[PDB]
Structure formats: C-alpha cells, structure tokens
Design a protein around this nucleic acid. Sequence first.
DNA 1: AATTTCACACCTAGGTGTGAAATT
DNA 2: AATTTCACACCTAGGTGTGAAATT
Lengths: 184, 183
Amino acid sequence: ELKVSLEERDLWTRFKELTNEMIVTKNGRRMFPVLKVSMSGLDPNAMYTVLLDFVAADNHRWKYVNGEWVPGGKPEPQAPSCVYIHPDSPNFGAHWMKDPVSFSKVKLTNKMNGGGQIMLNSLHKYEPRIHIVRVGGTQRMITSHSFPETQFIAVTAYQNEEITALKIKHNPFAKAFLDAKERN
Amino acid sequence: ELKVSLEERDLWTRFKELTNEMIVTKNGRRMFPVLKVSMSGLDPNAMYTVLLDFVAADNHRWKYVNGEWVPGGKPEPQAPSCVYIHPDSPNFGAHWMKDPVSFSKVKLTNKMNGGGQIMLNSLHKYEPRIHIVRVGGTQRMITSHSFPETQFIAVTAYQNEEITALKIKHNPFAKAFLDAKER
DNA sequence: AATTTCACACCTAGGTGTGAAATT
DNA sequence: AATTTCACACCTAGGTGTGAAATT
C-alpha cells in the first residue's frame, strides 16, 4: 500500500537536467512547475493532514560562473524550512486519493514574514518533501517522501536563460513573453 | 454557548426591504451579497462539517406585476435544494470560529448540471440555511441556522431596478456600471 | 562586483449587468 | 405575452519576467 508518485514527471525532469531555479521574492513567489503528487494506500476513512517543507540539498552556497552553477566558500549546515500545511487539511484518506494533490498556493520567500510563506535562503539548493500525518486516535503514523527531480536552487533573478525559456514556455502566467517569441 | 451570526447584516437588510432578487444562470451564478457568518461556542478541538442548502420560503410562483412581486397560480411542493458542503470541511472548531465563515464559491443554477452547483427554480422564493455537523457527534449536535433577511426570489434577469442599483453599487465585479454613473 | 528590489506591461482567470434575440 | 439565453465590454484579482535602480 502507501504510495506517493510525482505528477508531471517529464517536465520536472527537463528542469532538473538544466539545474532548476526557483524565484523567491520579498512578497512570496509561487513554484513552477507546481508540485503535484498522487497518493494511495491511505485508510479511506482515516483523517490525514498533508505537509510540505524544504530540506537543504547540500551545505553549499552556489554561484553562477561562466554559465554554470558552481559551489563555493565555507560550507554551512542548513536547517529544513518551516512546514506548509496543505490547504485541504485535515481530510479523509479517500479525499487525498481521489484527485492528485497539488501544492499550487504555496509561496516561497527570502524574508521572515509570518504569512504562511516558506522562507528559503537564495543561492542554496533545496528539495521539497511531503508528509502525510494521521489525525486523531492515540497512535502516531507519519510518512515522508522526497523527489530528487524537484531539486532547485532558490534565486532572486534567473541566471540560466535555458530555464527562463522553459518557465516561459510552460507557465500560463508567462504567456505574454511566449507569445512575444512566437511572432518575433 | 453556540452562536451563529450574519455578517453584513445592514446590506442584507436593505436588500430584504426591496425584496432581494438572485440571478441564476444556465452555468451557475454566485450570490450577492456573499453569505458570511461568525460562529462561536463550538468545541475548539472537535471536527465539524458545515453545510448550506436553500429552503422554499413559500409555495408560490412569483411574478413581477406593476412594479411589485406578487404570488399567483396554484401552489406546489418545492423540495429542499441539494446540499453544498463548505469547501473547508471537515475541519476543527477552532478553524471555524477563527475567521468569518463565507460561502462565496457556491453557484446557483436553474439546470440539473451535477457540478456541485445548487439548482433552484426561478420565480420562487428561497431562504439559505446553514448546518453545522459534528463529525462523530450525535444528531442533536447538528444545528441549523436561517436568517430571514437573506430571503430572495430566484430570477434569470432583474425586475426591480432598485435591486440592480444596489448590486451595482456594492458588487466589485459590477464596477464598470457603477463608474458609468459617477461621472 | 554581486545580488536584490521594484514599477511596469501583459497575461491568466473568471464575475457582472447589458440588451437584443431566442425560446416557451 | 413572459421568461430565458447569449455574446460582449469591462471589471476584479493576481501571477510573470523584464531591466533599470538600489542595496550589499
């Protein structure tokens, strides 16, 4: 039982191969691609809460040198980001398994604004991590699952234009720019 | 302990006074004003599901005659509407009491399209009804709450221009029309 | 020098009353 | 006649990368 799969695996893979970059802003920025996963093997009638946090992919600050991401400086330990409760929580296993679970509303930021936005440090790699926590009862049951293909480097401005082109070609809110290309 | 209060009582009252009309479309229409309520006296740790449905205010088909809504023809039985599950359900009492509970996403239609939209019959009077159900509770722990100032007549097109004017004045999505008056 | 901020043009998404036209 | 439908301009609401400007 208990299986959690990554939706849109192909698009994520393409981002990984280019070394994915996620914008983080003073006000909070949404992720792209949107983290979507499928879960099964949950007690359909049990109550569960889904959580999302980000763990440091390594202890290096990265820098873009000669068109390539490169680690540098004194390596430092990085604490896992604060947790983001998926908005559908708490909810039945049946609900969680009906349709794919999407984290489309989570906002990433570089500030410590307690508005339910996940603070991350730019120029550091992160890997999203999902937690399914059983609600109620007296026994604890908690599962975690990370996806290597969702690793990215938090940034305040894109560096690799190959990524920017992938964002533009796939994110609806960036259609203006895509349209600009399809005619010029 | 338990108390469920209507938010924007003033605006609803004004609509009531003019005999509120609610547009219903083949695709579903949102309510205006938006139905919001403050609830308190729930077990902060208990799990609750909030529901919304509409009950027929009477057995008459209404018609707008000489600038007035009047009942006519023969009465019939108007069954209660299907139920709408507040999107935040199921959830803790603490969550329900923290911030006003709003039903802004409920769509009203005059077709039997199974899309989570509530079907109503136009030219009929209805009154929204909210139910708080304790998950695992008894049956007595299920309370109901209706507010007579939220009564309205379902319509496919406004009849009383005084209502149209209040809708325009207060619904942000109708600003184009309001602006068109303030110059 | 390197990285963050910011006003802005441009989209996506989707809620409104209009009023003519179509339907009952 | 009485009521419903429908394309349309015009809004609200808010997500994007751009590139100059400000900060470190």
